Amino acid sequence: DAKNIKKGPAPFYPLEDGTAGEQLHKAMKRYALVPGTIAFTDAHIEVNITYAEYFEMSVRLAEAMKRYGLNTNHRIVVCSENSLQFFMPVLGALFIGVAVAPANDIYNERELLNSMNISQPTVVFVSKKGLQKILNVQKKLPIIQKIIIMDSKTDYQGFQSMYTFVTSHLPPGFNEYDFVPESFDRDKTIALIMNSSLPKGVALPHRTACVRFSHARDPIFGNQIIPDTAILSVVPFHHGFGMFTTLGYLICGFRVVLMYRFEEELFLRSLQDYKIQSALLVPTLFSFFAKSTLIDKYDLSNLHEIASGGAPLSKEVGEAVAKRFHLPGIRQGYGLTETTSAILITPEGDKPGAVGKVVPFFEAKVVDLDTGKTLGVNQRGELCVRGPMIMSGYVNNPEATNALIDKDGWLHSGDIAYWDEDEHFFIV
């Protein structure tokens, strides 16, 4: 009964062709050509980096990695707290088809080795403060040939920075605006290898990012592209919420204001002073802001939304946070690392405490817990989802993959849900 399979509507804008790197290159080149357009802002040190600067350096890294010898057969790791520099190697790799494996920068040293043992990187990009951890891992994974320091201009402790690495490998006369990103099969070529909440590696083809880019610009399931839009992001860039919201914001030309350490006054003062339209919180920051009383001391009249993304809020906490911030509700999402980003999303302007509706290109159902039979309206069962952001598989673990994703391609989320007459989903 097709009536019991919830289907996303058609996207406002048709899904664009090209790899994720080709799509990001094209958008970012355009914003690059408008001087003064801000890509990222570091709320702690107050520095802005423009799209022209971001574009040029990402293109330069792409060419430098290509000349060094990286191709679709290689992976890199990015291991860094949130920073102005984080996405530079991410974008450069995407531009040339090299898979990016972000490693949680507060992983203890065992968890870190586990993650890099699965991703098997040839090159590691790390912040200064992560260098010692990476050196210790490298003693055990000889495949790591080269370590490049992200938040330095000169060489740092005998290692090249991104800047000196680029200079070592760029051809004479290199022109950032003549560069053409690589073209490859976006279904077979892996864009990201993300870690599971021992964590596994989740392989995500370029296709899954391309679909995210359609949602991110969707006026219903995303944010409308409006000039001078600014986002405050406190979520980790190495995890799917931060990774795939930020890439979408770059596609949209927005200003991404970041923090790498949560503080109450800096956060609220940043919302006010950067006239943030949209803020992203990790889940336990919601319980925090339900307790905060300082909110009313700031002018937050440009704030239109607070988004929890993949992570599902209790109906009570979501309500208490919306109230504190004088908002009609929270822009919720439900997703997993395994679905790339949110595949249920609160449609713009529209149900307490629904998590949202099925995104374009996807289908969702709920099934009986004993039997697997599809259930009807208002009936509680296991949420299953199907669509082109589902991971291609856990790296080198077909058994955990087949345990999660059945033979018809339904991913079994492990969560309990129901959908209603309006097709809003509720996570119980």
UniProtKB/Swiss-Prot annotation:
One of its GO terms (biological process) is bioluminescence. GO terms for molecular function: ATP binding; CoA-ligase activity; metal ion binding; Photinus-luciferin 4-monooxygenase (ATP-hydrolyzing) activity; protein-folding chaperone binding. GO terms for cellular component: peroxisome. It is found in: Peroxisome. This is Luciferin 4-monooxygenase. Its EC number is 1.13.12.7. Belongs to the ATP-dependent AMP-binding enzyme family. The keyword Transferase does not apply. The lineage of its organism: Eukaryota, Metazoa, Ecdysozoa, Arthropoda, Hexapoda. Its cofactor is Mg(2+). The keyword RNA-binding does not apply. Its main location: other.
